Ligand SMILES: *[C@@H]1O[C@H](CO[C@@H]2O[C@@H](C)[C@@H](O)[C@@H](O)[C@@H]2O)[C@@H](O[C@@H]2O[C@H](CO)[C@@H](O[C@H]3O[C@H](CO)[C@@H](O)[C@H](O)[C@@H]3O)[C@H](O)[C@H]2NC(C)=O)[C@H](O)[C@H]1NC(C)=O
Ligand SMILES: *[C@@H]1O[C@H](CO[C@@H]2O[C@@H](C)[C@@H](O)[C@@H](O)[C@@H]2O)[C@@H](O[C@@H]2O[C@H](CO)[C@@H](O)[C@H](O)[C@H]2NC(C)=O)[C@H](O)[C@H]1NC(C)=O
Ligand SMILES: *[C@@H]1O[C@H](CO)[C@@H](O)[C@H](O)[C@H]1NC(C)=O
């Protein structure tokens with residue numbers, strides 16, 4: 001008689017018992033859903049004779065977990081520290097996340113799992129490779145070293161290193177690949193024909209030992225004057241002495257290294273092996289000049305056939321050097 005209606009549904013709460021109508025004298029209890037609280041706690045109400053439920057002061061509000069916006073040496077992604085939500089973590093470079101990467105604020109107003117910490121990445125003292133020595137290494141964290149620190153070895157004399165010489169601290173707390181130092185010796189160098197070779201005094205020549213070369217008065221070197229033991233047991237290079245050329249004409253203007261020179265004065269003491277010049281030849285049809293090349297190879301140089309060196313006396317004839325380019 002003059003029943004009460006179904007109670008109002010209010011945010012984040014439950015009503016018990018939930019019926020569609022109530023007799024006067026029946027009781028209902030409002031509770032905030034788990035994870036929410038409210039000033040004054042529950043509300044109980046009794047359906048009165050009027051059939052009208054009283055006013056409901058229920059204030060259902062999500063719990064809040066402790067402030068968690070500051071992760072020393074790292075970064076929290078968050079919207080709000082309220083009951084439904086989760087937050088996630090990362091760390092600045094040189095640091096790792098010691099703990100879980102995300103946390104959740106639970107019904108009990110607690111973070112689970114517990115908030116993490118960023119710790120500095122460190123690598124243990126590095127092992128020294130066989131036949132090596134630490135040239136530079138200073139640990140920045142007691143006996144250990146921090147991220148991106150480096151150390152480098154050098155081998156002992158007569159030993160050749162394979163792979164980069166420095167190692168650095170990875171983000172995973174280990175070091176990069178280590179060098180290998182082996183012993184390497186090469187054979188003796190060959191003395192060159194018409195030349196000499198000098199190298200130090202000992203039964204066996206090892207890595208980065210240096211031998212130097214020379215040539216007699218009419219010959220010059222084919223390669224570098226100095227050579228050394230490479231890491232693979234042979235030599236930098238193995239040069240020979242080749243024969244210079246006599247200048248093949250009496251008077252002619254040629255291109256040596258992009259500039260016109262007079263071959264008789266530029267090579268007054270001979271053309272060296274490998275010296276290349278370009279002679280001037282006359283296209284008759286087009287009344288002009290063009291150039292063909294000639295190179296001194298082991299005492300032999302071959303002037304192009306088209307070339308005609310005019311007599312000193314015959315002044316009328318004009319050298320291809322003086323005729324306009326084609
Ligand atoms: C220095 O540490 C690196 C860290 O990677 C790993 O993480 C450690 C914490 C440990 O848990 C273990 O997983 C490794 O040590 C080493 O990295 C190597 O290189 C790859 C990339 O990091 C990787 O490998 C995987 O993938 C490749 C092909 O893509 C596969 O060939 C291999 O089977 C793996 O699935 C892996 O991280 C690791 N692999 C190997 C073979 O080492 C790194 O080796 C190490 N350096 C030294 C000198 O110790
Ligand atoms: C010095 O020796 C290296 C090593 O190559 C050699 O080749 C083997 C067949 C044998 O001769 C061994 O003594 C060495 O293993 C030479 O490096 C080589 O260079 C060319 C380039 O392609 C070729 O022969 C090989 O690919 C290279 N070697 C390897 C192992 O791949 C080098 O040229 C030699 N000479 C000098 C002056 O360094
Ligand atoms: C770091 O190394 C030292 C030796 O230099 C040694 O006493 C110990 O292993 C480390 N330091 C301390 C205080 O234990």
Ligand SMILES: *[C@@H]1O[C@H](CO)[C@@H](O)[C@H](O)[C@H]1NC(C)=O
Nearest residue numbers: 150163164165166167168176
């Ligand atoms: C490898 O060695 C070279 C020459 O020693 C050096 O410049 C380079 O930095 C090394 N590699 C890396 C990744 O540092």
